[PDB]
Amino acid sequence: SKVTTVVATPGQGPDRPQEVSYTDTKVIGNGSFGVVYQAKLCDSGELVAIKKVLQDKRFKNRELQIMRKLDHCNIVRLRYFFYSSKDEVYLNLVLDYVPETVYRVARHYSRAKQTLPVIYVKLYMYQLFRSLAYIHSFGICHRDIKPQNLLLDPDTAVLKLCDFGSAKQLVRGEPNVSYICSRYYRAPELIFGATDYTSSIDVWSAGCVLAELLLGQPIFPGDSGVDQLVEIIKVLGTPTREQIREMNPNYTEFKFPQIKAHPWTKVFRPRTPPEAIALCSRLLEYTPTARLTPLEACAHSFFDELRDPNVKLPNGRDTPALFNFTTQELSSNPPLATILIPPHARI
Numbered sequence: 620s621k622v623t624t625v626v627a628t629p630g631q632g633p634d635r636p637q638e639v640s641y642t643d644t645k646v647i648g649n650g651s652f653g654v655v656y657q658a659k660l661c662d663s664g665e666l667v668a669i670k671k672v673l674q675d676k677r678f679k680n681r682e683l684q685i686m687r688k689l690d691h692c693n694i695v696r697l698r699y700f701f702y703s704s705k706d707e708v709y710l711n712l713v714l715d716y717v718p719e720t721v722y723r724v725a726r727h728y729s730r731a732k733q734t735l736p737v738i739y740v741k742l743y744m745y746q747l748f749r750s751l752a753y754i755h756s757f758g759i760c761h762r763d764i765k766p767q768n769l770l771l772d773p774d775t776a777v778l779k780l781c782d783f784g785s786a787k788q789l790v791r792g793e794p795n796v797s798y799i800c801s802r803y804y805r806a807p808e809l810i811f812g813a814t815d816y817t818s819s820i821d822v823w824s825a826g827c828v829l830a831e832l833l834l835g836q837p838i839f840p841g842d843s844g845v846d847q848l849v850e851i852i853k854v855l856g857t858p859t860r861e862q863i864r865e866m867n868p869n870y871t872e873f874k875f876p877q878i879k880a881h882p883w884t885k886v887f888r889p890r891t892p893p894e895a896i897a898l899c900s901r902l903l904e905y906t907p908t909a910r911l912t913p914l915e916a917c918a919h920s921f922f923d924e925l926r927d928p929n930v931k932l933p934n935g936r937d938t939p940a941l942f943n944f945t946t947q948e949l950s951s952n953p954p955l956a957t958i959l960i961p962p963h964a965r966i
């Protein structure tokens with residue numbers, strides 16, 4: 620049937636355009652992220668996703684430039700990119716295809732009034748924390764961490780962060796837009812108009828994802844952008860004057876009734892593991908600098924089961940790769956390696 624041949628640069632690799640042929644074309648996506656097709660590569664028979672976006676030459680594509688740097692087992696890989704079609708041009712990103720997401724899988728459980736087994740919550744969170752450590756080590760903040768942007772192969776349990784359409788290199792002193800992330804996952808800095816925010820917003824969002832996987836629903840289901848704060852206050856209580864300043868130095872008229880935090884253990888279901896709750900509490904903190912780094916989150920005792928030599932997937936198979944760190948990934952705190960790479964995994 621219908622074969623399409625393009626000339627396409629490999630996404631990471633020397634800058635060397637090659638003829639690439641694909642077939643079995645259909646729309647699988649048309650969202651926030653742009654129009655996306657599934658396609659099958661003629662040589663390997665391998666299924667890929669192709670994001671096709673109108674690209675003006677009067678600037679460079681940010682997402683392109685970000686994806687070209689990334690190479691990590693927990694991040695969607697840009698295989699190739701290519702240009703196509705007025706005198707109108709489309710950038711085309713040829714990306715890994717994965718059939719599921721954490722959102723879809725979680726929804727399947729929740730509709731059945733069920734809880735995702737904690738081992739899967741561990742597997743998924745750990746892998747998201749690694750992807751975050753990795754992108755953060757380049758100054759890149761994703762800014763759209765939510766369950767929908769977590770690709771998931773349901774059989775191997777490998778997770779890949781995708782949709783870098785909101786992502787951006789954060790530079791100290793260059794201001795950035797506040798009204799960013801999906802609402803339920805939006806860090807309170809941002810709700811407070813902060814413009815000097817760091818990559819620790821991704822970690823707040825990661826916190827929310829953890830909480831959602833343990834609750835079986837979003838922890839902060841805001842009716843509206845301002846109401847999102849109200850939902851936060853119902854658990855963390857009101858932030859202090861000093862928390863407000865740490866979130867946004869410009870925020871002054873802070874006129875509010877002081878509300879007590881709800882204790883963390885009563886936020887979750889009766890038998891939730893205490894290591895999970897403790898991990899949450901160190902992610903969902905008003906004060907941006909108080910939140911764990913991704914690398915530290917990875918080293919948290921909540922994830923100790925994954926560092927057991929005898930651990931297995933419930934389907935009987937081996938876990939995916941968890942310990943193949945690079946020195947880039949470890950660069951924020953290289954000694955963490957002694958916890959993160961356990962005895963059994965260096966021979």
Ligand SMILES: CC1(C)CC(=O)C2=C(C1)Nc1n[nH]c(C3CC3)c1[C@]2(C)c1ccccc1
Nearest residue numbers: 647648655668714715716717718767768781
């Ligand atoms: C989740 C569904 C059923 C529908 C979808 O939009 C994607 C899928 C399969 N599978 C996908 N595999 N890879 C990709 C994107 C291009 C990298 C997708 C898509 C295009 C995606 C996933 C997550 C966020 C945005 C878009």
